[PDB]
Design a binder for this molecule. Structure first.
Ligand SMILES: NC(=O)c1cnc2[nH]ccc2c1N[C@@H]1[C@@H]2C[C@@H]3C[C@H]1C[C@@](O)(C3)C2
Length: 269
């Protein structure tokens, strides 16, 4: 996509959270809200940035945030990435404020799997799958964002043992993160139940440089996040399956889609 946004029609509304900001884009001096990501940076962060832009340019799917174009970023001697803006924001902000039923959360889970299967079918890994990077376009439509860490296959509290211990990252490693993301959904991203809160409670906060190693030891011993309240046993077993220590015993996102379809159906009625 070679779409170019002219800086002259861009007015900043707010920062969204690399840095992503919300702009109005209005050439008739009433128009479209857009999210714009901008790259301070130096040590080949620039090449990673070119990677992100090129990855997003090629991805087109209902459950992946839509690429809209680029604009000259004279101030960082780069491009800025222009994306669709989603007003409800990320599930991290939305879920604490609302009380979503199980069937709806399962639908979100299914849609995340669809976007991720698509991504994997493109030979890309995401490496940052967490509730905070899942955006809610409408009450029944989820989109995966934040491709900042995404890579062509040649967040430590969301990472599988092979990532933490060996610095490897498989398709199966994104499936582990999906498991943790699904746990977030079922706890409505309550901070007191969050993966950092729960794992720091076991590890403690006085382990010098060894936090990650301690986390790894607990995972390899088979320690896992608890069953959220009113998560069905079968959904908890699905999560535990996304968390197999051995990467090859995890389901793929392709495996997960028909299962999640079926369970959503069951809880919907
Ligand atoms: N298209 C977008 O990026 C985007 C689109 N609509 C949005 N509405 C509110 C935030 C937001 C977006 N924000 C980003 C998203 C969520 C949060 C903050 C931004 C960086 C983050 O990593 C973490 C991914």
């Amino acid at each position: 996509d070679p779409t170019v946004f002219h800086k002259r029609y861009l007015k900043k509304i707010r920062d969204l959270g690399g840095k992503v900001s919300l702009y109005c884009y209005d050439p008739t001096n009433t128009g479209e809200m857009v999210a714009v990501k901008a790259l301070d940076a130096g040590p080949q962060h620039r090449s990673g940035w070119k990677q992100e832009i090129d990855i997003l340019r090629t991805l087109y799917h209902e459950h992946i945030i839509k690429y809209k174009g680029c604009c000259e970023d004279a101030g960082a001697a780069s491009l800025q990435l222009v994306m669709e803006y989603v007003p409800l924001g990320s599930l991290r902000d939305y879920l604490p404020r609302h009380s979503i039923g199980l069937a709806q959360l399962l639908l979100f889970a299914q849609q995340i799997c669809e976007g991720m299967a698509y991504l994997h079918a493109q030979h890309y890994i995401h490496r940052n799958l967490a509730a905070r990077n899942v955006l809610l376009d409408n009450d029944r439509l989820v989109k995966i964002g934040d491709f900042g860490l995404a890579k062509a296959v040649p967040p430590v509290f969301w990472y599988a043992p092979e990532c933490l211990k060996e610095y490897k990252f498989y398709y199966a490693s994104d499936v582990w993160s999906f498991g943790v993301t699904l746990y977030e959904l079922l706890t409505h991203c309550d901070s007191s139940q969050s993966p950092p809160t729960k794992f720091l409670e076991l590890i403690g906060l006085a382990q010098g440089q060894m936090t990650v190693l301690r986390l790894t030891e607990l995972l390899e011993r088979g320690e896992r996040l608890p069953r959220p309240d009113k998560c069905p046993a079968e959904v908890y077993h699905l999560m535990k399956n996304c968390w197999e220590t051995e990467a090859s015993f995890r389901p793929t996102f392709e495996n997960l889609i028909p299962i999640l379809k079926t369970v959503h159906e069951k809880y919907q009625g």
